[PDB]
Amino acid sequence: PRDVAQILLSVLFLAIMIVACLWIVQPFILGFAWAGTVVIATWPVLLRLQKIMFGRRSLAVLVMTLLLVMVFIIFMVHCALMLLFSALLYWRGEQVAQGIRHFATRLAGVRGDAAVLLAAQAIRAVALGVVVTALVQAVLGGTWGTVLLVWSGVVGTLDNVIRPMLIRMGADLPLILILSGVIGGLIAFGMIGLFIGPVLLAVSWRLFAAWVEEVPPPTDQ
Amino acid sequence: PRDVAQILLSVLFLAIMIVACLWIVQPFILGFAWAGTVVIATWPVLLRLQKIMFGRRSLAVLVMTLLLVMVFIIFMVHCALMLLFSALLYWRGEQVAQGIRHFATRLAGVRGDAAVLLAAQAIRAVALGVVVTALVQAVLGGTWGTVLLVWSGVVGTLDNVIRPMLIRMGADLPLILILSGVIGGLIAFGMIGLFIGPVLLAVSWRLFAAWVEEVPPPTDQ
Amino acid sequence: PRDVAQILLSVLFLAIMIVACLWIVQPFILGFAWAGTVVIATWPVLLRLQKIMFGRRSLAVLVMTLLLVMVFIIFMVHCALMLLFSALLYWRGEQVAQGIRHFATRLAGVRGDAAVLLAAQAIRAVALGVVVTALVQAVLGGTWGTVLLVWSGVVGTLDNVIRPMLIRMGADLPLILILSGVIGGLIAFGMIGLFIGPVLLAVSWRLFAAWVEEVPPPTDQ
Amino acid sequence: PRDVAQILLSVLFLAIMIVACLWIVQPFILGFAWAGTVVIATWPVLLRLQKIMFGRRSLAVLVMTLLLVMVFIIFMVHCALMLLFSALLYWRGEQVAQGIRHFATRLAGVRGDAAVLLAAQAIRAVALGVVVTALVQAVLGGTWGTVLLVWSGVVGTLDNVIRPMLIRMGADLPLILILSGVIGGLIAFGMIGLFIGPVLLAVSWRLFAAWVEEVPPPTDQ
Amino acid sequence: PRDVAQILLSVLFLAIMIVACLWIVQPFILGFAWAGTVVIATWPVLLRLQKIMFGRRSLAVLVMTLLLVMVFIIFMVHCALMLLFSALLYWRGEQVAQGIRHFATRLAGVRGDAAVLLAAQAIRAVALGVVVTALVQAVLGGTWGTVLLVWSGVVGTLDNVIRPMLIRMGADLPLILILSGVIGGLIAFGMIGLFIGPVLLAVSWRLFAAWVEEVPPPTDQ
């Protein structure tokens, strides 16, 4: 059996390594979260551009980053790091996705992989909701309530049918979960909890549901 | 055997998930606690209304939420969330009860299920006590001591007999436990510990009693 | 094997239950400690009164609580709770003692039961010391040093012989342990560490001595 | 099975020993880190001097410490400790390296040894980068951006070919990892994170990669 | 298998017992540390006095405590506790040593016993160093640097030979370890780390060396 000294020292060293790595990466962390939230959001667009431009990933990355810049303009400072991370993740998105899924698989066998895929799915859903909210605001031109109203309109009576295979994000995710995640993320984290909240709530809900369903449900008697 | 790295990372990730989920849901937590305390309290009333109105759960939910509003009036701000959660829990009370009991069963085999049922029973008892206190205060019209006096009067000499099958809440719960829970909850949490205190004390007492009774009692010799 | 999720959730829920229960009972905790310290101290007196008054526990409890009041007078506010707890523990002392010993037995097989009995024995010893100190102060009438001097006089040269079977408290307890416990309790907790200090030190010493004696003593060679 | 008391006391005593030892060594810790960062950096230079001066380690240590002084001058206070530690580590570098690698081997079987060797390799890489940055700054004579530009120039288009077997440091280490480590270390620790950041990130990355690769990668299907 | 409840409650109760005992003994702790550091330091002197005065431990304790007083004078307040503890430990030194070694043996089989013996050996070494420092200061009569210079002079060129079997303390202990322990203890704890530092560092070094040597040293290849 392993002695107490080795277990304690391993725990202590792993804790130091994790804390030090987060401390080192902290100046980049928020930028990375944004650049990568966007990347998950717009990955199908990147694939379409890939198909369009002769199957050159470099061209697709260049055009997509230029498009992102043209979305910002029309504050590059403190966002050039975000653009750089977005370009890197567009260039090596498949590798980073494989790494994340493989780490999750190591943590939890198949539940972790499904959790990662669900988190990507939720990010895509929330991003489409935000894009639709911005479009509707522009149309009404001639933000708190607009996102919520758009979310209700998108999935409330329009479950999956109209605009086929395009609102299939919400078909796999709970309405209440996404709504509460968005609101709690905005209140708690702020403009980034808009994506963190739904992701955390959806992933936690799926993990806990899968974990709890292992035992049979209690009998009424 | 599982290595230290996996155990530590699983513990750390679960802790982060739990803390982040509580942080996200925190703006709603108190409202949810109230809306759901009420729902456990008035569930038999909801079932009676269900029976009355042609067995339509939607009609019962609408009427019961309208009744709750007519109890508030005669401050909707910062309480519309409470009303919304109450309506949702009235609509899907059985599903949420099944989920809570099934999670408790996963945590503790049968002790958790009994703990959840006891917590519901204690909430119902305290709610009936509070309703009787308010009624007696209205009659004396022509709050600290009134609740305590009503609690003593309800179960002190009236154990279970008069008003049959109606004060059967206290038949399964300790007097001292409920009284101390009410007082400590009011002092500690405030107007919500009125229900948290009795629930926490009753659940903890049942769990610890069941746990301790596993070994035989110590012999006097 | 139990998974990490269940172990972590059980630990977290038990910690929440314990912390919440202490938070709820906190307004009563000190009063309960006093009312129950006294009860352990005066239990033989209660048994003698029980024998005197026709074997009626209610009469013994009434007379003993009245005697406690006549000791306070000759500040009832913030002490009526103490008197109430004292009366309850006088009424159901055997049940509470059985519960404490049975919980200790569940924690530690036989070491816990012996620890509880030792804690009661130490409380009785310190209480007799305090009573003798007060009596000697009254005689000298015609507090820090008086208790210490009385403790030295009681057991220093008078080990167990004079006043037979009456100073048998100190025959089972270390002098240094009681003295240091009294002093450290007064300095740390204040007028209640007068009983907590000796109890904690005696219980910890017995537990650690029993634990350490399991292995053979190290050889000099 | 080991009882809870022994495990808890062992953990507590080891924690006290570690915390007390760090508390005692704290006045020296930073100096030691520097004197030893330098020693890892300039070890090949020390070996060349060893070969030059008749294979006398004492002569090599003396000359190398004198050279370090001549680098400082052209603030000895609060640095004489650094010079002393540098001289000691130059005198007994192999023994300290063996001790560090052997402790790492005890913690992690072969992963720890590889981690230590990687940390030394990363320190050597960053030190060569810093030396080249200082040289280029002197040439441009006739610091934040200069180090980064030098790092890009050293390995960006010059992977390993020009100046053969001399930029073989970067051949085993990620560009992004070193760059992010340098930046995060400067921002977090300051002029010492210049070496801590790359070391922590490289070691953590290798450990986590080796740990995660144990399970097969998740299948796309 | 033991359930989670018992493990958690045992850990929690042991933590409470340890914390409460340290809290109670805290007013005495520093005095005890000093009175007992001295006792380990002067134990051979006590044995010589024992041999001189007809083998009467009481006489030896009386004379040795009187000698300690004559060292203080030529501030008894806040030191009478120190003198009392010194007298007690002189009276029952063997019993306390047996208890400490037996507790250490229970914690760690043979490594703990060796650690305790090493701690005593280090205390004796540092005490002899301090005595020699004071003597040399008195001779130079006609403190920071004097202790360090005396330490270098005692063992630097005089390893064990001159004054035979009298500087055999340093023959078993590292120079660097003692020096760093003294300096770090003075800086961290203050005039008591003069003994704590060397003890903590020596004990930790021996424990970690013994622990690490269990696995074979890593091969160079």
PDB file of C-alpha atoms in Angstrom, chain C residues 4 13 17 28 47 53 69 90 101 107 130 138 151 154 172 179 181 205 216:
ATOM      1  CA  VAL C   4     -15.525   9.822  -5.730  1.00  0.00           C
ATOM      2  CA  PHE C  13     -23.651  17.214   2.980  1.00  0.00           C
ATOM      3  CA  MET C  17     -25.652  19.514   8.205  1.00  0.00           C
ATOM      4  CA  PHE C  28     -28.578  27.862  23.208  1.00  0.00           C
ATOM      5  CA  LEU C  47     -30.471  10.734  43.390  1.00  0.00           C
ATOM      6  CA  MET C  53     -39.172  12.108  48.246  1.00  0.00           C
ATOM      7  CA  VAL C  69     -32.754  29.133  41.774  1.00  0.00           C
ATOM      8  CA  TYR C  90     -32.735  16.528  35.562  1.00  0.00           C
ATOM      9  CA  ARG C 101     -22.447   7.130  25.665  1.00  0.00           C
ATOM     10  CA  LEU C 107     -17.518   6.638  17.216  1.00  0.00           C
ATOM     11  CA  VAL C 130     -15.282  24.812  43.077  1.00  0.00           C
ATOM     12  CA  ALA C 138     -17.181  32.146  52.780  1.00  0.00           C
ATOM     13  CA  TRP C 151      -7.163  22.156  44.581  1.00  0.00           C
ATOM     14  CA  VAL C 154      -7.797  18.762  48.460  1.00  0.00           C
ATOM     15  CA  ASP C 172      -8.516   8.393  38.914  1.00  0.00           C
ATOM     16  CA  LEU C 179      -4.652  22.019  37.285  1.00  0.00           C
ATOM     17  CA  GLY C 181      -6.956  22.286  32.388  1.00  0.00           C
ATOM     18  CA  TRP C 205      -5.015  12.257  27.504  1.00  0.00           C
ATOM     19  CA  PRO C 216       4.967  -1.924  22.607  1.00  0.00           C
TER      20      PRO C 216
END
